[PDB]
């Protein structure tokens, strides 16, 4: 269904050079991703560690289908940023259910809604996003070495093309260029990793590789050394893609350069798909009996990366003045918790890994919506800061500085508290969802003798909490540097709005000012839901946590 949607959307896009069709191509992509969810929900009535599909090249697991549906739902939420205009004129006179469904409002809205903005004029943008989803979804379902390479390239190439999609932006072309070049080096390690596996084992299926690893584990001419250190080179190419230290220098630079609406998809989706693929490959290749092979485990790279990502992520973020250079370092410290949970291969660590990855994806999505919404809210605000006049690509990245958020509690108080809750959830403060995620990973690692990494993680969290608190200190401790625009609220200039009925007949005409302009509901409702999930997780915890208990029991059963 994802491919049928790609081919159908590509056929309509191919006969149109009309840029006014971009908003509607994006709304159709949201309907298409909702059919993929219905199909994936229908496929969840079986219990199994895996069923080979299409000649053994692909496979389906309950874990596979849960993660595809999550990828499809995250994608629907990100797609909202290109399928609805950022600002909406709302009036109490046009607020009933009868009014919404049977009455029309006419006013000049090109400037108020930013109809001809860059995020509203790229025609192929929802089409290229579907390509990354398709690559992400196959990679979860891959069963073969050749399948792995093709799917990670389909994911990677579309991410390069999304980073360069703003062609008239020098900043985006550079982030796209850096990402493509360094990601091409990343794929050369993945290809070398797969090639050495096939060259030494004669097989291309992971299912066959797992059996060779399992027989080999006992307690004289062919010792299976190649498996661990072919998987090590294989793993290094994926630690780049998730941006784990010391292969993380690229993401702070690229995330800050590309447009913010683009950075939300580019920085979230690839992590979800790669960590799920690595999870099942970590489980099958674990040796249940300690031997010489266990001394050379490729999973040691995952512990080095988690140890480094915890240290690098929290320390280098201390002196980051750029909001998006800071979110990347924040992610680098969070993938350290994900990597540490993944490296301890235990029922408790696998539940902790599943739950941390889902909650951080929804929480990091909340941060990006708030950032994107705080920017669009500055339309009726004016500033005189020499620093905010020297910023580049202000349309693609409206908020680029932490200082630009100074005094935002005095401009939008509840939107600022939404960001405060999301940031406090990144710190790990109870009773927010991020505390429970972090303490589940700490639990599992404590129970498995990884005491030293648990001590490192808690110490880095206090270091990482320093720059989190600096964001909140700017939003609440200082006065705003943004003032209301004097012309858009002057009590002498207003625009006129007509309210029409079901058949083009005037009911009443109203004269409106800049105080009658608000954030469009798709972005306020989305932020409201994710904020409330973070806040009240302690009351809605049972089904979500029990989903991961069952998925992990299946993976460890039989």
């Amino acid at each position: 269904m994802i491919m049928i949607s790609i081919l159908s959307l590509l056929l309509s896009t191919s006969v149109t050079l009309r840029r006014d069709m971009s908003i509607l191509f994006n709304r159709i992509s949201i309907i298409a991703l909702a059919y993929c969810i219905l199909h994936d929900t229908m496929s969840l009535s079986f219990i199994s560690k895996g069923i080979g599909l299409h000649g053994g090249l692909l496979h389906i697991t309950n874990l596979t289908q849960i993660f595809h549906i999550f990828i499809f739902i995250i994608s629907i939420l990100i797609l909202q940023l290109t399928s609805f205009y950022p600002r909406k004129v709302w009036i109490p006179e046009y607020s009933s259910l009868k009014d919404i469904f049977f009455n029309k409002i006419l006013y000049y809205r090109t400037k108020i809604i930013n109809k001809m903005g860059e995020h509203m004029k790229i025609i192929e943008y929802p089409l290229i996003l579907l390509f990354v989803i398709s690559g992400a979804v196959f990679l979860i379902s891959t069963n073969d070495l050749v399948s792995i390479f093709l799917s990670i390239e389909l994911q990677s190439y579309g991410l390069y093309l999304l980073s360069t999609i703003y062609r008239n932006s020098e900043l985006s072309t550079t982030g796209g260029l850096i990402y493509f070049l360094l990601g091409g080096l990343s794929s050369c390690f993945i290809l070398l990793g797969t090639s050495l596996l096939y060259v030494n084992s004669g097989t291309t299926s992971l299912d066959g590789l797992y059996i060779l690893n399992s027989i080999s584990d006992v307690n004289s001419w062919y010792k299976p050394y190649y498996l661990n250190f072919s998987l090590l080179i294989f793993s290094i190419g994926f630690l780049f893609k998730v941006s784990a230290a010391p292969f993380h220098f690229w993401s702070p630079d690229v995330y800050d350069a590309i447009p913010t609406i683009v950075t939300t998809f580019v920085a979230i989706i690839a992590k979800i798909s790669i960590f799920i693929f690595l999870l099942e490959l970590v489980y099958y290749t674990n040796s249940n009996a300690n031997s010489y092979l266990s001394e050379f485990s490729w999973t040691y790279a995952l512990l080095i990366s988690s140890l480094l990502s915890l240290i690098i992520g929290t320390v280098v973020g201390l002196t980051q003045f750029r909001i998006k250079r800071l979110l990347a370092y924040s992610t680098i410290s969070h993938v350290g918790f994900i990597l540490l949970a993944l490296s301890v291969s235990s029922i408790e660590s696998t539940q902790a890994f599943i739950f941390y990855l889902i909650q951080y994806s929804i929480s990091n999505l909340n941060a990006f919506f708030i950032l994107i919404t705080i920017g669009f809210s500055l339309y009726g605000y004016v500033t005189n800061n020499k620093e905010y006049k020297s910023l580049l690509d202000k349309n693609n990245s409206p908020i680029q500085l932490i200082s630009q958020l100074k005094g935002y509690f005095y401009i939008n108080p509840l939107l600022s508290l939404s960001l405060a809750i999301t940031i406090f959830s990144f710190v790990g403060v109870p009773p927010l969802v991020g505390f429970f995620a972090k303490q589940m990973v700490l639990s599992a690692a404590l129970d498995n003798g990884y005491i030293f990494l648990s001590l490192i993680a808690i110490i880095t969290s206090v270091i990482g909490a320093v720059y989190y608190l600096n964001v909140i200190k700017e939003i609440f401790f200082y006065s705003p540097e943004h003032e209301v625009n004097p012309v858009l609220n002057e009590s002498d200039s207003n625009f006129s709005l007509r309210i029409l009925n079901e058949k083009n007949v005037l009911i009443r005409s109203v004269l409106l000012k800049g105080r009658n302009i608000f954030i469009s509901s798709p972005f306020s409702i989305t932020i409201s839901i994710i904020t409330n999930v973070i806040l009240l997780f302690i009351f809605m915890n049972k089904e979500w946590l029990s989903m991961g208990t069952i998925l992990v029991q299946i993976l460890f059963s039989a």
Binding site: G158, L161, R167
Partner: protein, 80 residues
Amino acid sequence: VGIIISSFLFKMLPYGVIISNKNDLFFITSKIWDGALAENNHISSIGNIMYTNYNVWLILASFILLLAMVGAIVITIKPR
């Protein structure tokens, strides 16, 4: 970098490749009749399986090429 990678990447390669790196070995080949009934050319042997047994690799490969055809044009096309 040359020494470390090459030394480390040497044992990652199998005996079949490291062969032919004063008593050397000689490869011996003979003939079969059952396996020679209708010898295929290598391109025919790949065709025997490339569109049935491994058709998934073809569908995925055709979608990488499609994204490349659409993306390379989208980022370089002159506006109209």
